[PDB]
């Protein structure tokens, strides 16, 4: 699993199921894995799930 990497949400994201990670613009998401070209997996707000790469920017 990925360690020490984070992304910041650029927009709010409300998922379609509990497999998807909900967040608000500005939230910092702790990255865990990459699902495919368009989706990442991470944790924020106590939950773990998938979300779109296009909704975040990777932090330095």
């Amino acid at each position: 699993l990925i360690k020490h990497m984070r992304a910041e949400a650029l927009f709010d994201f409300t998922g379609n199921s509990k497999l998807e990670l909900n967040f608000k613009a500005g939230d910092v998401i702790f990255l865990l894995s990459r699902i495919n070209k368009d989706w990442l997996e991470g944790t924020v707000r106590g939950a773990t799930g998938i979300f779109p790469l296009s909704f975040v920017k990777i932090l330095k």
Partner: peptide, 13 residues
């Protein structure tokens, strides 16, 4: 700013 479109979800159907 408007939210971008959501990419197709992973699937096997």
């Amino acid at each position: 700013k408007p939210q971008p479109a959501v990419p197709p979800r992973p699937s096997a159907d």
